């Protein structure tokens, strides 16, 4: 069974052909994240966007493991030239790349992508994105941080989805209503997993309300550390 686990906020982990992939590795500064910077093994890191709660420990993790960081062209240049990360792969929206683990395709999201420096100036890191993985015959749609958009149904029709990770926190993303609508109306995956809630007071939600509002496929409310059952 394909290995795919949730680890708090928008952090997911998966294996394809014995290669380890993490998304949005907010580990050391998320007390609800079950992962440890010291012990996690990865060959690749994929970033949906540059916000602190996704960017997280990418620099320290990339350096320690020698993992390749996949993201926007701006993100790749930033990690490379500002942070000195040796192994980066720049991409953009609609772009697909084949790696030894499987494929990464970046899709559109509605949000922002920046990392705020000490002077208070946000450093722009491209348009925010979602990820479509094809790994061991499974199609995984991580929506990233996003508002509701009708082209979610274009992404899902062109890439029928096994597992969708969808933010339900509200304030900074879709809340319960928009995220359930996204699943019911546009994505219709076999498995839905809600993400990006409870990490901060502002995004505390009852994921049961999400599960009650979803009428299509299976909803799996994964706590940090738990894996998707296929």
Segment interacting with a copy of itself (CB under 8 A) among 19-27, 29-37, 60-68, 79-87: 79-87
Question: Cα separation of 142 and 19, whole Å?
Answer: 19
Q: What torsion do the CA atoms of 5, 33, 27, 49 make, to the nearest 10 degrees?
A: 60
Q: Decide: is 51 part of the binding site for Ni ion (CB under 5 A).
A: yes
Residue 200, φ and ψ in degrees, nearest 5? -130, 150
Task: Show the tokens assigned to 207.
Answer: 């994921």
Segment interacting with a copy of itself (CB under 8 A) among 24-32, 56-64, 71-79, 220-228: 71-79
- For a copy of itself, the binding residues in 123-142 under the rule CB under 8 A are 123-128
Choose, by CB under 5 A, the member of 36, 119, 150, 171 that binds Cl ion: 150
Distances (CA, A) of 169 to 52, 65, 95, 177, 220: 16, 31, 28, 11, 16
Segment interacting with Cl ion (CB under 5 A) among 53-61, 85-93, 132-140, 146-154: 146-154
Q: 31 contacts which partner out of a copy of itself, Ni ion, Cl ion, none, CB within 5 to 8 A by kind?
A: none
Question: Cα separation of 217 and 182, whole Å?
Answer: 13
Q: Decide: is 145 part of the binding site for Ni ion (CB under 5 A).
A: yes
Q: Which residues bind Cl ion (CB under 5 A)?
A: 150-151
């Amino acid at each position: 069974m394909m290995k795919l686990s949730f680890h708090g906020q928008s952090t997911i982990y998966l294996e394809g052909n014995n290669k380890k992939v993490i998304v949005d590795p907010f580990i050391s500064n998320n007390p609800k994240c079950d992962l440890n910077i010291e012990t996690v093994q990865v060959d690749y890191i994929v970033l949906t966007h540059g916000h602190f709660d996704h960017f997280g420990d990418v620099v320290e993790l990339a350096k320690k493991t020698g993992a390749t960081v996949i993201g926007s062209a701006e993100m790749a240049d930033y990690l490379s030239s500002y942070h000195g990360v040796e192994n980066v792969h720049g991409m953009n929206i609609g772009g697909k790349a084949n790696f030894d683990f499987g494929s990464v395709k970046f899709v559109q999201a509605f949000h922002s992508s920046s990392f705020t420096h000490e002077n208070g100036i946000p450093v722009y890191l491209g348009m925010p994105m979602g990820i479509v993985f094809e790994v061991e015959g499974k199609t995984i749609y991580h929506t990233g941080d996003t508002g509701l958009f009708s082209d979610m149904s274009l992404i899902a029709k062109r890439h029928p989805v096994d597992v969708c990770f969808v933010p339900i926190g509200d304030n900074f993303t879709m809340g319960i209503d928009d995220a359930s609508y996204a699943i019911n109306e546009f994505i219709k995956p076999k498995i839905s997993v809600p993400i990006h809630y409870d990490t901060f007071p502002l995004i505390e939600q009852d994921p049961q309300q999400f599960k009650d509002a979803v009428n299509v496929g299976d909803v799996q409310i994964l706590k940090p550390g738990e894996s998707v059952q296929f």
